[PDB]
Tab-separated table of C-alpha atoms in Angstrom:
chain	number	residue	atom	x	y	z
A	243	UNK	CA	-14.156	-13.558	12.000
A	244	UNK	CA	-16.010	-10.600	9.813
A	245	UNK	CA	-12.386	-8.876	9.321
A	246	UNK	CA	-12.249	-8.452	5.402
A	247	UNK	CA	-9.167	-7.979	3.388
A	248	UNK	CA	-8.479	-4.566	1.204
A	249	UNK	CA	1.606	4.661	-5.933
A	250	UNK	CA	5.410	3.754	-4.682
A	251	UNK	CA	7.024	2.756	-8.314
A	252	UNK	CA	8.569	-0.312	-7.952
A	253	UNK	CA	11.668	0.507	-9.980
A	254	UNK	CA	12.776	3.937	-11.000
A	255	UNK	CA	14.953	5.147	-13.680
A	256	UNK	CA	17.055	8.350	-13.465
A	257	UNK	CA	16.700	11.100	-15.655
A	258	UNK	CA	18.681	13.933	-16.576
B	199	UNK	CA	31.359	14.742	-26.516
B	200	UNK	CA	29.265	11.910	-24.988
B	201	UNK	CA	26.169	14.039	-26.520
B	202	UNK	CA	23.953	11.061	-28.687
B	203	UNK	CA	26.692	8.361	-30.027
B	204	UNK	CA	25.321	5.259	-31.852
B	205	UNK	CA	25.154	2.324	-30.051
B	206	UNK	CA	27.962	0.919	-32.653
B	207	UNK	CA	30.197	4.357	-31.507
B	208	UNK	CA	29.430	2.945	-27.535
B	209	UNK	CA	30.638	0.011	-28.630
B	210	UNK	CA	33.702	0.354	-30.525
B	211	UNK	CA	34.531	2.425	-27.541
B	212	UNK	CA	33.668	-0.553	-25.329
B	213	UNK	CA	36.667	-2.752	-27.088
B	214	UNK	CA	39.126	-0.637	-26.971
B	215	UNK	CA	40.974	-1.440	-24.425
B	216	UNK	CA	41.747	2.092	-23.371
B	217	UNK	CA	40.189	2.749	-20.328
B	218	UNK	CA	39.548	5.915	-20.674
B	219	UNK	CA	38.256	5.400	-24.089
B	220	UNK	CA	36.019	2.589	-22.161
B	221	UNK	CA	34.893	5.578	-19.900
B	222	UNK	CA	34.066	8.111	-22.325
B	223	UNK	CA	32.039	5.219	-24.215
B	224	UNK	CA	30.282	4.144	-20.688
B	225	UNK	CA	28.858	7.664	-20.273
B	226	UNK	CA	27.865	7.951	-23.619
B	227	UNK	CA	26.073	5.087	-22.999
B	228	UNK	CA	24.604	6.304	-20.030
B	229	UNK	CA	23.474	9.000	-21.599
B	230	UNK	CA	21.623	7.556	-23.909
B	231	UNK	CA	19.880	5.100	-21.182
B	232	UNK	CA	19.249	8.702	-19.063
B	233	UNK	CA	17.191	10.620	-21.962
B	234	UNK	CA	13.786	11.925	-21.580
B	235	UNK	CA	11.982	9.131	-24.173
B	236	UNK	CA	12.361	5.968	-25.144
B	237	UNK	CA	16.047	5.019	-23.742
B	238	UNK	CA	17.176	2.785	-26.118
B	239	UNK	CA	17.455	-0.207	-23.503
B	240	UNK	CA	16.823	-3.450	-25.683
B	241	UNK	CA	19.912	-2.309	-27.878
B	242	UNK	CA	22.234	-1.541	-25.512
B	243	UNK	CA	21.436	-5.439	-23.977
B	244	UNK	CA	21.218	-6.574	-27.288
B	245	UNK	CA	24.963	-5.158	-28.129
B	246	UNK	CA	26.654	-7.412	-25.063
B	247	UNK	CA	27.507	-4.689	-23.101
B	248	UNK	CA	26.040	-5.695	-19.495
B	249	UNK	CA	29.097	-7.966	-18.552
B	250	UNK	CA	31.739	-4.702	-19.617
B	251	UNK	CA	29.576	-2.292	-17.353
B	252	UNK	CA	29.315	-4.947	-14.571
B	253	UNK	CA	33.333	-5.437	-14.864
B	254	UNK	CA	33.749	-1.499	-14.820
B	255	UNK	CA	31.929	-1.543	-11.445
B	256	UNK	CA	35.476	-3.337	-9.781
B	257	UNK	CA	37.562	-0.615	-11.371
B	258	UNK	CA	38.079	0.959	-7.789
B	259	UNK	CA	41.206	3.270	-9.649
B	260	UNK	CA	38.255	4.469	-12.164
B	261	UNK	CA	36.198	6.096	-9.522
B	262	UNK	CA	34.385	7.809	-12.529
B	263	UNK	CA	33.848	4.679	-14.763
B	264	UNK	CA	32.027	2.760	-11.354
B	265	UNK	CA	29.653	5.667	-11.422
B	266	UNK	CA	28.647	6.014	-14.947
B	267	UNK	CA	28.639	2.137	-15.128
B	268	UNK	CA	26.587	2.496	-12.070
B	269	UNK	CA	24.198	4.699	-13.543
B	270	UNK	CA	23.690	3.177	-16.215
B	271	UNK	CA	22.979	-0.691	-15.332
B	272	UNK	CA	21.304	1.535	-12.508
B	273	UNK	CA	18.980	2.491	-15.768
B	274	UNK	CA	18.691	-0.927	-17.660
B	275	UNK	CA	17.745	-2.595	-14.420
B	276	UNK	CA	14.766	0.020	-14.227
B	277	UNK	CA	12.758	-1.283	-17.278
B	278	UNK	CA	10.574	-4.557	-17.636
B	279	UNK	CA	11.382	-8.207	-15.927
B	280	UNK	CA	13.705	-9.415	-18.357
B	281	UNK	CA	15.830	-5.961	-18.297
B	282	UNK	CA	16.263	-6.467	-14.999
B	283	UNK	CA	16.730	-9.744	-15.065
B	284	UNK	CA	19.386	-9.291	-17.708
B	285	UNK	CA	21.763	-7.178	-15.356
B	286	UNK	CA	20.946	-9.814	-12.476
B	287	UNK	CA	22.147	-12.328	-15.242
B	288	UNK	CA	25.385	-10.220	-15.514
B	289	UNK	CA	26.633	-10.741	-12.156
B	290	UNK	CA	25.345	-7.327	-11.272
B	291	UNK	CA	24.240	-8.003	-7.585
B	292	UNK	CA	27.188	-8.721	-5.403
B	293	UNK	CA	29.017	-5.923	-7.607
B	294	UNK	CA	26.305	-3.421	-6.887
B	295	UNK	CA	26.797	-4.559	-2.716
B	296	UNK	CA	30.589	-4.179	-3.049
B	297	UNK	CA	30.221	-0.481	-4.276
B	298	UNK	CA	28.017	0.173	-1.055
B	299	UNK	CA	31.540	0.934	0.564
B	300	UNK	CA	31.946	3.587	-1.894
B	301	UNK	CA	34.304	6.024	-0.296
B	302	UNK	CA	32.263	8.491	-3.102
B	303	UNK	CA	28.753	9.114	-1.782
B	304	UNK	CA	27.570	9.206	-5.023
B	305	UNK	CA	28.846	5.833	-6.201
B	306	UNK	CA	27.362	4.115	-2.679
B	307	UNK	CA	24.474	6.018	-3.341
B	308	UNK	CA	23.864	4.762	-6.944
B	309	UNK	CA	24.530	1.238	-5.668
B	310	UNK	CA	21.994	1.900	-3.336
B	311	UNK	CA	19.669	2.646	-6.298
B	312	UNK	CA	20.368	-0.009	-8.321
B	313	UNK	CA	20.165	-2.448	-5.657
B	314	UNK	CA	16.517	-0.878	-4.910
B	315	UNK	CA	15.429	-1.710	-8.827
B	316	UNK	CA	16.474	-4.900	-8.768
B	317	UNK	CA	15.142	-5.627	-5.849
B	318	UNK	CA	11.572	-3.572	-6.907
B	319	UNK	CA	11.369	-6.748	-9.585
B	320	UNK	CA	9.741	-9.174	-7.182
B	321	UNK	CA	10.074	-11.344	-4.581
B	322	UNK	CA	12.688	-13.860	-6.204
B	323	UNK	CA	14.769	-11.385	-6.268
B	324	UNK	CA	14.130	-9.171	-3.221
B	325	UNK	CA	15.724	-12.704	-1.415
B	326	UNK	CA	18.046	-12.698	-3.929
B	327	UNK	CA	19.555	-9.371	-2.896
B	328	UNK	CA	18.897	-10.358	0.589
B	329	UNK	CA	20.482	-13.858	0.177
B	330	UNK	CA	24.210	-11.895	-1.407
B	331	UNK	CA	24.179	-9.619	1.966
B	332	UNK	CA	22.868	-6.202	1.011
B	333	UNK	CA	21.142	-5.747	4.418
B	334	UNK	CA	24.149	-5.199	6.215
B	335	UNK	CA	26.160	-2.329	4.549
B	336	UNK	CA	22.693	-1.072	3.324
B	337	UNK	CA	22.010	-0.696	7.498
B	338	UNK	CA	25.431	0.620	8.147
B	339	UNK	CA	24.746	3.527	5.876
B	340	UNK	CA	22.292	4.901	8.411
B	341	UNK	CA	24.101	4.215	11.501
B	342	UNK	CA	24.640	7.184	12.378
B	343	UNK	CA	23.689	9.308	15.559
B	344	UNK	CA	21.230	11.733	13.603
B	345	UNK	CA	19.742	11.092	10.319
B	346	UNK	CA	19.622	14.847	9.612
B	347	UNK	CA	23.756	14.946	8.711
B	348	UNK	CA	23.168	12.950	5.667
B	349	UNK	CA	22.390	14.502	2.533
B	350	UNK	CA	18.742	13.963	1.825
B	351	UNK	CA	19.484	12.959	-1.823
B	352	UNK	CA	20.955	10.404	-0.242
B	353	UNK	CA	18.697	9.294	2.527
B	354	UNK	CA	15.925	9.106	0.341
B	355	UNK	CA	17.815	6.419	-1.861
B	356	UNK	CA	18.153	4.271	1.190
B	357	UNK	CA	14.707	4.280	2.572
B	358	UNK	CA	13.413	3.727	-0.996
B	359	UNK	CA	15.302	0.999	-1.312
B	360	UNK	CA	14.879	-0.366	2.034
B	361	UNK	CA	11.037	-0.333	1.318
B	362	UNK	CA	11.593	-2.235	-1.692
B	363	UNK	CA	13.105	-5.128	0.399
B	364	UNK	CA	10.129	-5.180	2.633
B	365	UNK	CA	7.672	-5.604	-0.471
B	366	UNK	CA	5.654	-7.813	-2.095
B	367	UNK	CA	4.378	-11.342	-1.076
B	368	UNK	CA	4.033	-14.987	-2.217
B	369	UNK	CA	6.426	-15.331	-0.259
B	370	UNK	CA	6.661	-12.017	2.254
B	371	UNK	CA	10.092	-11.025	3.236
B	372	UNK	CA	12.439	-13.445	5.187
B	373	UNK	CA	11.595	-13.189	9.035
B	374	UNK	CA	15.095	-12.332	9.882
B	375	UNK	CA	15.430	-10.060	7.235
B	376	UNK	CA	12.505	-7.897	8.551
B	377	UNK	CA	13.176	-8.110	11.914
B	378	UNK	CA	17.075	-6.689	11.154
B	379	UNK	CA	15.144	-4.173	8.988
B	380	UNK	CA	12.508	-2.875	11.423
B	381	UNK	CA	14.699	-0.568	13.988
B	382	UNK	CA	16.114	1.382	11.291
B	383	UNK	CA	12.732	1.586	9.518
B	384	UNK	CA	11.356	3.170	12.713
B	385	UNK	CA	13.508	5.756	13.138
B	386	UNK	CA	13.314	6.767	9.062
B	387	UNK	CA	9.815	6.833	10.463
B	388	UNK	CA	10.154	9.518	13.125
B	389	UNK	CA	12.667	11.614	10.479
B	390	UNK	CA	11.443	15.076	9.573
B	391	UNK	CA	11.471	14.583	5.063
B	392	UNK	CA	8.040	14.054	3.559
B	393	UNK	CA	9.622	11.914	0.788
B	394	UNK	CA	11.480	9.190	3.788
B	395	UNK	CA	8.299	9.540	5.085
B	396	UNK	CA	6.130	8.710	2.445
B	397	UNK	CA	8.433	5.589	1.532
B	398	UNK	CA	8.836	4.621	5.116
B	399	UNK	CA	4.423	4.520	5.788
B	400	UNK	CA	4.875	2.431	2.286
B	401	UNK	CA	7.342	0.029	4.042
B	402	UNK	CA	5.507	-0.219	7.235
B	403	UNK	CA	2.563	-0.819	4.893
B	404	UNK	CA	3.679	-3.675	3.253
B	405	UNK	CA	5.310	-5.369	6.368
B	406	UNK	CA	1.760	-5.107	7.944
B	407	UNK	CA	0.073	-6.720	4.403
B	408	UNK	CA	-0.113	-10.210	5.903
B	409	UNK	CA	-0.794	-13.054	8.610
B	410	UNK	CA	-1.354	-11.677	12.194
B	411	UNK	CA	2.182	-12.929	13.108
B	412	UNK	CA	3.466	-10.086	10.622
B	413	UNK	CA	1.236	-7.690	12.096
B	414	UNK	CA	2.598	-8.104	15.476
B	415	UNK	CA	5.931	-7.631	14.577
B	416	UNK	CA	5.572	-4.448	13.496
B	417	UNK	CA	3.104	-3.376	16.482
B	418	UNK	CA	5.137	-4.467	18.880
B	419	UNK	CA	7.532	-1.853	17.957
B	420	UNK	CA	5.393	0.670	19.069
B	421	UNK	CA	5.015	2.656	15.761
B	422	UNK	CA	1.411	3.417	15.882
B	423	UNK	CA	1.068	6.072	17.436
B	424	UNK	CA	3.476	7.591	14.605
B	425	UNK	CA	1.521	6.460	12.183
B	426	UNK	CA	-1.715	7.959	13.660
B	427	UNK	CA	-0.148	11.032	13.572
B	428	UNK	CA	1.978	10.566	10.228
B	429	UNK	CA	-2.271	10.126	9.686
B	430	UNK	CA	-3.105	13.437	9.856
B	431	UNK	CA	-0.050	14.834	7.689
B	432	UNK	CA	-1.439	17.210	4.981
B	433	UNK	CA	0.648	15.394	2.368
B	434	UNK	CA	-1.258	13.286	0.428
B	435	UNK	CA	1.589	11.132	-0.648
B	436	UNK	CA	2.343	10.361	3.838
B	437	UNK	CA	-1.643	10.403	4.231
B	438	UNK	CA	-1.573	7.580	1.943
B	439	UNK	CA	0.584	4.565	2.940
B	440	UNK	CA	-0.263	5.900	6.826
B	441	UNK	CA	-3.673	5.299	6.109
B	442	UNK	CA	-2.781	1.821	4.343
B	443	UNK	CA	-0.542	0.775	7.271
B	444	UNK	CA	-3.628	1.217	9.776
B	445	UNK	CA	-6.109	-0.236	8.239
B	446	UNK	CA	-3.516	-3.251	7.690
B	447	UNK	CA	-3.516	-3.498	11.636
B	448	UNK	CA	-7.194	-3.816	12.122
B	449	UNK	CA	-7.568	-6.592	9.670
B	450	UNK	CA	-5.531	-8.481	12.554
B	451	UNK	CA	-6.615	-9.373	16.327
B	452	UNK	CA	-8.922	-7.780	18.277
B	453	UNK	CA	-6.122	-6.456	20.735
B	454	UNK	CA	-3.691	-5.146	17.265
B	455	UNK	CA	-7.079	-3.269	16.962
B	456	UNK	CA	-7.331	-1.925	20.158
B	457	UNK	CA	-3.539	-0.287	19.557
B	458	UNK	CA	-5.030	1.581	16.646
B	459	UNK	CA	-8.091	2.785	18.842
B	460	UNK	CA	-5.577	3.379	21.937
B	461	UNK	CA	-3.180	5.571	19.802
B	462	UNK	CA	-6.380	8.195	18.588
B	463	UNK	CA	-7.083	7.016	15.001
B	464	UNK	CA	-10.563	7.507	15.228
B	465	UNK	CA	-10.544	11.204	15.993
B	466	UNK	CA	-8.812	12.008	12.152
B	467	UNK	CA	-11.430	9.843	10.397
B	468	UNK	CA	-14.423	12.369	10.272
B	469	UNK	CA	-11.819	14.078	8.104
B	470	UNK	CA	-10.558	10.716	6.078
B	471	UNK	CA	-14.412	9.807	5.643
B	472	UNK	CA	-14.939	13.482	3.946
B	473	UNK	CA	-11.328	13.486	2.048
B	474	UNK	CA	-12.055	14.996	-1.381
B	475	UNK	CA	-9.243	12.331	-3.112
B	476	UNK	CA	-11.969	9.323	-3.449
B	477	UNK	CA	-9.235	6.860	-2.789
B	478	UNK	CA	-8.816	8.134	0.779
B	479	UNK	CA	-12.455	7.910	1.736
B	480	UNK	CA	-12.625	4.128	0.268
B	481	UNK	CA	-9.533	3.545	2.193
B	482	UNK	CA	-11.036	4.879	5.234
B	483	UNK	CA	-14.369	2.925	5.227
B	484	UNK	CA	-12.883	-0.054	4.312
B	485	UNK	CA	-10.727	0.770	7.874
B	486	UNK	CA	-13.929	1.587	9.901
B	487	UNK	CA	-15.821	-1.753	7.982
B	488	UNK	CA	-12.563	-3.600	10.054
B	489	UNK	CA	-13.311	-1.841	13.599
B	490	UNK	CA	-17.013	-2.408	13.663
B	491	UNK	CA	-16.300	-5.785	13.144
B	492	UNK	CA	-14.552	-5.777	16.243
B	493	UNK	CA	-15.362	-6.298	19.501
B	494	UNK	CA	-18.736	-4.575	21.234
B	495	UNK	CA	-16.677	-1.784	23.410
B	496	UNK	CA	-14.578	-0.842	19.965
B	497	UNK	CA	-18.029	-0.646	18.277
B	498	UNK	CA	-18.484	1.626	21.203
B	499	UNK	CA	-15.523	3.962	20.730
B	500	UNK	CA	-16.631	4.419	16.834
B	501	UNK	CA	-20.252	5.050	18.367
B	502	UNK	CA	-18.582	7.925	20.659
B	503	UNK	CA	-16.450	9.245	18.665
B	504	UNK	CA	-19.590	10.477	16.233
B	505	UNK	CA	-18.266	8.780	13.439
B	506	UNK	CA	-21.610	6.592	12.879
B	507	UNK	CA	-23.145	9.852	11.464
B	508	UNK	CA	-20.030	9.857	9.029
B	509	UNK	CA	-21.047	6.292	8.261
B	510	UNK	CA	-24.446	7.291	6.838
B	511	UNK	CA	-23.041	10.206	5.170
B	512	UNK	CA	-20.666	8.089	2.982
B	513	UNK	CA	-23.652	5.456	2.608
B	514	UNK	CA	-25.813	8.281	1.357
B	515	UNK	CA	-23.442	9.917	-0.757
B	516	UNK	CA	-19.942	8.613	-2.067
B	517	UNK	CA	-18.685	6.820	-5.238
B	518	UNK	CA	-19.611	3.878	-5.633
B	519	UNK	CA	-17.147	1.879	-4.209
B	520	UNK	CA	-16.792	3.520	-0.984
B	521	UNK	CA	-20.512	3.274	-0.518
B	522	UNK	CA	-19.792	-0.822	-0.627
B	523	UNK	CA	-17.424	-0.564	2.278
B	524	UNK	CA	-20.098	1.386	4.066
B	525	UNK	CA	-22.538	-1.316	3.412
B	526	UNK	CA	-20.335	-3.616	4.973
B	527	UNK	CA	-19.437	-1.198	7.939
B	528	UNK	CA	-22.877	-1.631	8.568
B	529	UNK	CA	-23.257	-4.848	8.209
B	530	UNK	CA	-20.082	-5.670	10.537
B	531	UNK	CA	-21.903	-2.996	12.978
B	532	UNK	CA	-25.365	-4.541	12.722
B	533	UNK	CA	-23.870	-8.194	13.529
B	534	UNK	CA	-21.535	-7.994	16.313
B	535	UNK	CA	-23.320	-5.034	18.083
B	536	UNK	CA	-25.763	-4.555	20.850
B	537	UNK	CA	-29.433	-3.994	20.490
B	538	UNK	CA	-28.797	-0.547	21.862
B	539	UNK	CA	-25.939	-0.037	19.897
B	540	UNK	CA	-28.290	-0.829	16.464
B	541	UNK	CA	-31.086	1.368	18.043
B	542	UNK	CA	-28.642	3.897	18.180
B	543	UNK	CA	-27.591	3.194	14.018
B	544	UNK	CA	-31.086	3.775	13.103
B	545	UNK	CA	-31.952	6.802	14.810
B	546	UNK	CA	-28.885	8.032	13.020
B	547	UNK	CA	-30.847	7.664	10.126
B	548	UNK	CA	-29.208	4.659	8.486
B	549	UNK	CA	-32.324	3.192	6.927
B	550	UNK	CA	-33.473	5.400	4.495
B	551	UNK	CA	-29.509	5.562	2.362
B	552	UNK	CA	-28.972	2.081	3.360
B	553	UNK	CA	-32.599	1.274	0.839
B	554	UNK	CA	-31.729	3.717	-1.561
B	555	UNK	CA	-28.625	1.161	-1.896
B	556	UNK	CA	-31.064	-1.731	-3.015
B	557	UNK	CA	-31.291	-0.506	-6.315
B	558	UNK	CA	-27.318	-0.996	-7.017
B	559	UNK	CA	-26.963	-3.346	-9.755
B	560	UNK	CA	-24.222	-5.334	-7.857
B	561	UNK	CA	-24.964	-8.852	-6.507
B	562	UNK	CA	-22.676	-8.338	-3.417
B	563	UNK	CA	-24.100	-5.027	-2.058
B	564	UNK	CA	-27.161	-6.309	-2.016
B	565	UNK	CA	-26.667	-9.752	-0.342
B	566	UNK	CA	-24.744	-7.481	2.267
B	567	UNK	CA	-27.701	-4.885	2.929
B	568	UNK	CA	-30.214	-7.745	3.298
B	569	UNK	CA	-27.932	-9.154	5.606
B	570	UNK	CA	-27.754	-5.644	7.275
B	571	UNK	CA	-31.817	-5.405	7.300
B	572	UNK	CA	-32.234	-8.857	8.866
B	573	UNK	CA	-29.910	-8.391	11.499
B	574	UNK	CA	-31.963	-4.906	12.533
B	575	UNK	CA	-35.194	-6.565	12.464
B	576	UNK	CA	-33.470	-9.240	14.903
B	577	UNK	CA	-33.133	-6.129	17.182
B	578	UNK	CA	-36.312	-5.229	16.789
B	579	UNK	CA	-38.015	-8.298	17.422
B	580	UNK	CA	-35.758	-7.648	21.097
B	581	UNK	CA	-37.619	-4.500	21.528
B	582	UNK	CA	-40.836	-5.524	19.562
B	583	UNK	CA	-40.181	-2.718	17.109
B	584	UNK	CA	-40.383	-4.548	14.095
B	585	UNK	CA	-43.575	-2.910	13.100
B	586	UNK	CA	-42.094	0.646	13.276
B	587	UNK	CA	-39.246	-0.861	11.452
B	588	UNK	CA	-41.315	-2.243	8.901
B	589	UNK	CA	-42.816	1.272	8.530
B	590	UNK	CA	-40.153	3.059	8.094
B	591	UNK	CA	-38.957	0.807	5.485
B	592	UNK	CA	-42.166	0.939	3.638
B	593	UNK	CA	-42.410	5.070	3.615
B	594	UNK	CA	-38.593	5.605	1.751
B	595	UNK	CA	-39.705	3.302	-0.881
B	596	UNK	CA	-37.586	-0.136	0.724
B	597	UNK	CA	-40.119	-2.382	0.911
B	598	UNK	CA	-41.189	-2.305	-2.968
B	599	UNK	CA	-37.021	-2.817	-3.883
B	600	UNK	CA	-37.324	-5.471	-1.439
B	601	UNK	CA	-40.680	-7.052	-2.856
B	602	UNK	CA	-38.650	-6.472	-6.193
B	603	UNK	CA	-35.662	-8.497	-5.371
B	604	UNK	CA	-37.834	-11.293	-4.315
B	605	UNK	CA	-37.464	-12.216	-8.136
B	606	UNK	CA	-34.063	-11.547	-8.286
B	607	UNK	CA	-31.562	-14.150	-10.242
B	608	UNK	CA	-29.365	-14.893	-7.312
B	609	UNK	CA	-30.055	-17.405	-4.890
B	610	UNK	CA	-29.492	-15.243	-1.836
B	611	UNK	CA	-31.387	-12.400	-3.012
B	612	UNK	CA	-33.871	-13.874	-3.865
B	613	UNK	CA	-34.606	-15.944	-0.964
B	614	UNK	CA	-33.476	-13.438	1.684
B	615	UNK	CA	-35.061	-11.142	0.072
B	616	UNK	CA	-38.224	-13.192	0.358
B	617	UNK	CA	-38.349	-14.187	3.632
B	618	UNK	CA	-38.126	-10.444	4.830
B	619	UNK	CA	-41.495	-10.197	3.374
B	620	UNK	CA	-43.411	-12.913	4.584
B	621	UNK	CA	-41.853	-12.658	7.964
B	622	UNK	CA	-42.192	-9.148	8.263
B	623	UNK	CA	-44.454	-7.389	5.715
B	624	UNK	CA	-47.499	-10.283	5.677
């Protein structure tokens, strides 16, 4: 076929 | 107080024996690992204290030591592979899913957390998290009869985390795992937050990030048309993932396609294929470069929806990148389409951008543009039209890149290159 292949943190601390 | 102790301080505190000397030293700690810059995370590993923080976790009479413990393995578990690897290493995860029947929202909740950065690590363990049972309570957390009594602190957690089990490849998520995932991953979906619906379009985006068979799964649930619509949000950070998930889907079958068509994508792209965030437009023509190489009646619907004018406007004018998926649109157009279909692409005026192109120093564009060019003249020859073709080429300057690239370095180029000219220009 013509098909073709090709911002969330993955961990997060917490602040504060 | 608990305001900047030493690490020593933490730890004499540690040893004690006293548990509430143990507690006072635990948020101490935590503070520390909770400060704007540069939590000291290394040291606090470094000082042994990971297996004391992971023990504090079982201290169900200590509600407060669970949470600062919590909190701050929560913290450690945040930072680089072998951070979080370190609290794995400590017994951390079955700990962590014990907690999720907190009867302290706040303790479940920074379980829930936790759970979500060590999962975030990678796929080893993502199944390791999976493999010690955190799918289960983690579901019965949101099994309620409306999503909107929880607090949304709190809901956000969950779906974060959730989408963190549904990430990353080599290998994608257990089978069973997803599928026990999926109907409360809907319904976060459909729930009126931006944030659970940012992270939910992330999770639906990854789950669709694969083999057909994954794609499926998730279609058959029926959440397209939701994500069409989640489509035309005017938060960037839904826009996004939607956007991701959907183009996802048309990199699959001809009839996942067809879902994405059937559900009204196509009337928000001539606003994704003019969206002033650069990403979105790439995103968006990489999408369309999918549906026109599908089948001739979905080259149709992108034909009547107008969007082949959008097409050449992103071809004429676009960074750089996006103007490479537009090439390829084309090219996906110009080979699977009907003569009328490409008659129809030229009078839109495709030509004269699509030669402007030639002068890209990138190997690929080019070999894709020839491509493009060869397969119109093939329609021409249908109409005997390659004359007028040949014209028009000649007057916007194409035909002396083309007579150019005849001496090009690559193989392709040059040869494709030359046989346009003898065949068509001599």
């Amino acid at each position: 076929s013509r098909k073709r292949a090709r911002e969330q943190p993955s961990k997060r601390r917490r602040v504060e | 107080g608990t305001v900047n102790w030493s690490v020593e301080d933490i730890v004499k505190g540690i040893n004690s024996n006293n548990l509430e000397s143990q507690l006072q030293a635990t948020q101490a700690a935590r503070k520390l690992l909770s400060r704007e810059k540069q939590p000291p995370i290394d040291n606090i590993i470094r000082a042994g204290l990971i297996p004391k923080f992971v023990s504090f976790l079982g201290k169900t009479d200590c509600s407060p030591i669970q949470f600062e413990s919590a909190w701050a393995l929560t913290n450690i578990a945040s930072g680089t592979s072998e951070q979080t690897k370190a609290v794995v290493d400590g017994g951390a995860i079955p700990a962590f899913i014990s907690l999720l029947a907190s009867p302290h929202a706040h303790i479940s909740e920074q379980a829930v957390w936790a759970l979500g950065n060590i999962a975030g690590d990678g796929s080893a363990f993502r199944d390791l998290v999976i493999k010690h049972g955190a799918i289960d309570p983690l579901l019965a957390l949101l099994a309620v009869p409306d999503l909107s009594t929880l607090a949304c602190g709190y809901l956000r957690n969950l779906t974060w985390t959730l989408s963190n089990l549904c990430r990353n490849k080599n290998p994608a998520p257990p089978l069973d795992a997803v599928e026990q995932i999926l109907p409360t991953l809907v319904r976060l979906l459909h729930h009126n937050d931006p944030e659970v619906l940012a992270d939910s379009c992330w999770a639906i985006s990854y789950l669709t990030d694969g083999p057909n068979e994954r794609i499926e799964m998730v279609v058959k649930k029926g959440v397209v048309p939701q994500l069409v619509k989640l489509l035309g949000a005017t938060e960037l950070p839904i826009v996004t993932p939607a956007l991701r998930a959907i183009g996802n889907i048309v990199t699959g079958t001809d009839e996942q396609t067809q879902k994405v068509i059937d559900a009204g994508a196509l009337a928000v792209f001539p606003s994704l294929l003019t969206n002033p965030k650069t990403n979105i437009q790439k995103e968006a023509t990489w999408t369309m470069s999918n549906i026109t190489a599908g089948r001739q009646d979905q080259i149709q619907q992108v034909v009547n929806h107008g969007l082949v004018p959008f097409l050449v406007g992103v071809l004429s004018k676009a960074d750089f990148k996006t103007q490479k998926e537009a090439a390829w649109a084309i090219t996906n157009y110009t080979s699977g389409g009907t003569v009328e279909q490409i008659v129809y692409l030229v009078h839109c005026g495709i030509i004269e951008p699509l030669m402007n192109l030639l002068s890209a120093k990138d190997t690929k564009i080019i070999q894709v543009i020839l491509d493009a060019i060869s397969n119109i003249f093939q329609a021409a020859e249908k109409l005997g039209e390659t004359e007028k073709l040949s014209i028009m080429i000649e007057e916007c300057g194409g035909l002396d890149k083309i007579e150019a690239l005849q001496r090009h370095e690559n193989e392709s180029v040059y040869k494709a290159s030359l046989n346009l000219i003898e065949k068509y220009f001599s």
